Amino acid sequence: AVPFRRTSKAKKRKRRTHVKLQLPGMNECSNCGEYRLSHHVCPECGQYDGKDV
Amino acid sequence: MIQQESRMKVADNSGAREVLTIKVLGGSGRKTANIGDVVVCTVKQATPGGVVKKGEVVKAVIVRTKSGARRQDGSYIKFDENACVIIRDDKSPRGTRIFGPVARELRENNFMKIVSLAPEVL
Amino acid sequence: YRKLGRTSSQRKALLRDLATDLIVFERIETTEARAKEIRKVVEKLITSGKKGDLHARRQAAAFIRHEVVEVVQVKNRPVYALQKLFDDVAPRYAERQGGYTRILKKGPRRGDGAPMVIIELV
Amino acid sequence: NKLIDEITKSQLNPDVPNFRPGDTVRVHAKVVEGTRERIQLFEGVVIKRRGAGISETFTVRKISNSVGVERTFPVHTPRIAKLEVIRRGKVRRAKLYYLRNLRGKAARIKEI
Amino acid sequence: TKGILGRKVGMTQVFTENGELIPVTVIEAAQNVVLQKKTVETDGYEAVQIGFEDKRAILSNKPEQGHVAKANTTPKRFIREFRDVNLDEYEIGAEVKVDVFAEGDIIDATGVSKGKGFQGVIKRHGQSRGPMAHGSRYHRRPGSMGPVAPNRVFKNKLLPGRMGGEQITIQNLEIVKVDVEKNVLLVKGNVPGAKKALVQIKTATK
RNA sequence: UUGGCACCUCGAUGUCGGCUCGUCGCAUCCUGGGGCUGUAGUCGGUCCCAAGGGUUGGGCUGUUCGCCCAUUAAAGCGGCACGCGAGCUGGGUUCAGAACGUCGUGAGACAGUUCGGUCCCUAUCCGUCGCGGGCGCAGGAAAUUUGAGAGGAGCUGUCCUUAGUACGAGAGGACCGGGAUGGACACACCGCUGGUGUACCAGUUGUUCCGCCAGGAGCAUCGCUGGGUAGCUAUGUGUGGCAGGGAUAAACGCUGAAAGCAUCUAAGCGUGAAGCCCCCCUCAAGAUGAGAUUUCCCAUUUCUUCGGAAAGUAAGAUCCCUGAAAGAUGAUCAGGUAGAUAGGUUUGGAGUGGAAGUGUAGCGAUACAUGGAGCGGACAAAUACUAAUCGAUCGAGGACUUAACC
Ligand SMILES: [K+]
Ligand SMILES: [K+]
Ligand SMILES: [K+]
Ligand SMILES: [K+]
Ligand SMILES: [Mg+2]
Ligand SMILES: [Mg+2]
Ligand SMILES: [Mg+2]
Ligand SMILES: [Mg+2]
Ligand SMILES: [Mg+2]
Ligand SMILES: [Mg+2]
Ligand SMILES: [Mg+2]
Ligand SMILES: [Mg+2]
Ligand SMILES: [Mg+2]
Ligand SMILES: [Mg+2]
Ligand SMILES: [Mg+2]
Ligand SMILES: [Mg+2]
Ligand SMILES: [Mg+2]
Ligand SMILES: [Mg+2]
Ligand SMILES: [Mg+2]
Ligand SMILES: [Mg+2]
Ligand SMILES: [Mg+2]
Ligand SMILES: [Mg+2]
Ligand SMILES: [Mg+2]
Ligand SMILES: [Mg+2]
Ligand SMILES: [Mg+2]
Ligand SMILES: [Zn+2]
């Protein structure tokens, strides 16, 4: 319930291989050639599926 | 679903009236008994002048139960009380008359004098 | 079904609120779980509107909040969400069978990273 | 399920009548030995009718000799030779489980 | 020896000529086809590869399409081998109906049990709860890992985890009814898996 | 076990008994096999082989032990810090209080008693149980698989018959074998019996509200109460340990010498256990020994002086999205307009139990009809109405030698 030993730099880093976060699943609006999230409304043009909002 | 410390009204003429179970028979960890299954018992309530009396250990047969039975034809018989019959070492009663209804599982398990003396077997 | 961090009272209150709000404003920004429930709720109200029976109206009035959309000088008379539901909203979809409501994904909220959506009735 | 229904449709007994809880029935039930049969009558009141199709059951309650008995049957057994509805009963519940904590004069079901 | 693949449709009950009542699982076994016939010289073991359901060519792929085209039929969803089976039967492309069985014929039913998630020990492994009163703060915990001396705990000390999904065979079940029109097989009792699950029915080893 | 020694630990190695979980040995309690019997049979005594599985529930006590009741096929002996307190209890005991008897002038004490009395810790590492990501497995992919190896299970009674036969003066009463039905245990599943069912139905109390009546809503444990879908599940249902091969233990023997006989052994043959290896269930090619079969994509372009590289693709797979049969998250599985994946809608269905409004009867409460009505989370089938849009990303161009084919 208490550490018997201090985690070394290497073992710390070997845990931290997976804490990362991923590039977001985005792409360019067909209307504005400007990056946006798939299946989401573009915040720049305010448009979705060829239809303003 | 009769197990240790379960009580049962007594359905026969013998001096017993109410009964407590000591031991479900038929194996090591047999913990519940159903209709047609013998159970070692004590008498906790007796009628005066009876053959059987307060404090006597005796073997006895389960004859009607709230948790009853299912038959191979898909049908279930249930009662509103758990009742027993006190018997000898053979499968015969010690009393002479039998009260209340009764189940055919006894007829299956060769408790035939009980099946006979009872008024309505269901 | 979806629980929403809330016990049954609070959840039902939330849905009554959100559904009334979508009937009133016809477009609201919420979270996608709340939205994915009020689609069911609201569209089941639109059916009651499409029926128009008194029984459907009472059944809906048991759910919708009693609050005003606007006032109309006929003398100033207020209109209510139930009136807007049966007299304005649901006649719009007399010919549409189902699917009276869509959800458009907007993006994540700052203070809690919550995934937010616009829900509107077409 | 529809497929289940389509299979079990043949074993549906149409000889069974319309009956409900509250009503008194007489069940002409078969009781079978290794090579023999008796028909025995169970006349009592219907408490519940649950299920669907051939998975449907009803329970009939009786009081025999100061003891209450409660006998369940599938609706579509061939070991019910006949089912005679006698008294129909006005009653406000589908499940008449209250009759178990009741003996006579309170178990009385009003006929119509 | 003889076998099919099927889907579990559900459970019901059936009355037999005696008037006895018999629960039954329903298996719908349509579109069964023989796709490959494995040999001792080509592979090292004799078996018959059956494919069960027809599916769509956009859910399929070109490899599966080729393997089924070598049988002259459509892509399939479930494909499985059966062993201890004669190969002089089962010509490629052949359809494999429920009529291979018969009432009272006796089988093993093999399927993938239902999914309970992460579970504890008393549900999963059947252990006993500790008391819920008399001062207990030990209710549904697993018990001692073991003794002190090893400085370690032995394998097969049973612990929480993901309960189901395991493959299961139930043995010596009875076939009640056969309906070739519905492609339906009835089995006394049960089989593993939820509804819509794959069941592998075959003649019993014993 | 009682003890002896005082070698680790006094900068802490927590004690008896119980609960949870077990695991190991065999000096085997039961089941199994066998020899001797002062073994007639039934039952038994003693001894050899066997550790496969099994080996109860209560009363008194803090109790282990032990006595008792009642069962059992049997109620094994022991080791693991007399297993297990960062897993639980905390009754006893030796913390502080108080009292009894007793010893002491006394303070006070007693393996004398009695009543009462605080058991801390967010798991770093290994280990254990489950789930993923990465790479490898001399091209890249999709499915099906062998099975080294590994785990699991392995128990057993009672009744019938053989046959009231054998045996016995009778009393009694079999072996071997054939079959039926149970206990405990395991696995699975929810059609049945039931339970639960806090977004299903109803009744109902108080009070506030919806302007009032009426109908309804809020709070009161989901207000209480009667039911109950799916799902989860046992106490419920289905099945299981069947039948067995191969080689052995103890043992019984055949043949046969050494040792003209004898001898089960020395060479050599046979029988022979619940045990050993298999049969049965499950996992399993990271089985770096990285296996096999079937099918699919092809041999691109830039470069680089070589090695070798990157940079767009194919088969295929995914980011993303709708989701459940799945699920801690991932994963898995079902689908993504070449669409019924989910929601809604329409039909139904379980379930509840006879909506509202209106009318009739009644002073009224209320009752009746309209009308198995109305409502109906998760259930089923159809329906593309709503949202799964449009995109984007990863993903090969297949080294060398030998042999045979050629
Ligand atoms: K010390
Ligand atoms: K410990
Ligand atoms: K749908
Ligand atoms: K009405
Ligand atoms: Mg509340
Ligand atoms: Mg227990
Ligand atoms: Mg607690
Ligand atoms: Mg230290
Ligand atoms: Mg320490
Ligand atoms: Mg020995
Ligand atoms: Mg005590
Ligand atoms: Mg005790
Ligand atoms: Mg200890
Ligand atoms: Mg302790
Ligand atoms: Mg410790
Ligand atoms: Mg204490
Ligand atoms: Mg003391
Ligand atoms: Mg004390
Ligand atoms: Mg912890
Ligand atoms: Mg850790
Ligand atoms: Mg169920
Ligand atoms: Mg109120
Ligand atoms: Mg009112
Ligand atoms: Mg208040
Ligand atoms: Mg042998
Ligand atoms: Zn844009």
DSSP annotation string for E118-138: EE-HHHHT---PPPSSTT---
CA dist., res. A44 & res. D55, Å (int): 61
Q: Which residues of chain E between 20 and 39 are close to nucleic strand F, CB under 7 A?
A: 23, 36, 38
B1: domain range? Answer: 1-122
**Residue contact D1–E28, C-beta within 8 A:** no
Neighbouring chains to D with at least 3 Cβ pairs closer than 8 Å: B, E
CA dist., res. D93 & res. E106, Å (int): 46
Collect all residues with Cβ–Cβ distance below 8 Å to E84 and sequence separation of at least 6. E1, E205
DSSP A24: P
Q: Where are the domains of chain A?
A: 2-53
**Residue contact D72–B79, C-beta within 8 A:** no
**What domain count does chain B have?**
1
Residue E44's φ and ψ, nearest 5 degrees, are 115, -10
C-alpha E31 to ligand 8 mean position (Å): 72
Q: Which residues of chain D between 57 and 96 are close to nucleic strand F, CB under 7 A?
A: 57, 59, 72, 90, 92-95
**Residue contact B120–D70, C-beta within 8 A:** no
In contact, B111 and B11? CB cutoff 8 Å: no
Side chain identity, residue D36: R
Q: Which residue from A40, C121, C36 is spatially nearest to A48, judged by alpha carbons?
A: A40
E14 C-beta less than 7 Å away from strand F: no
Task: Copy the structure tokens of residue D20.
Answer: 């409900």
Q: Which residue from D44, D42, D46, D57 is spatially nearest to D21, judged by alpha carbons?
A: D46
- Give me the CA E96–C1' F294 separation in Å, rounded: 20
In angstroms, the Cα distances linking E24 to A4, B89, E21, E67, E190 are 59, 42, 10, 35, 7
Report resolution (Å) to 1 decimal. Answer: 2.9
Chains A, C in contact, 3 or more Cβ pairs below 8 Å:
yes
In angstroms, the Cα distances linking B114 to B1, B39, B100, B105, E41 are 21, 16, 11, 11, 71
Q: Which residues of chain E between 79 and 108 are close to nucleic strand F, CB under 7 A?
A: 79-81, 83, 108
CA dist., res. D42 & res. D25, Å (int): 8
* Range E133-141 contact pairs with CB under 8 angstroms and sequence separation of 24 or more: none
**Closest listed ligand to the CA of E145:** 2
Strand partners, D87: D24
- Which chain C positions have a beta carbon within 8 Å of A41's beta carbon? 104-107, 118
B80 C-beta less than 7 Å away from strand F: no
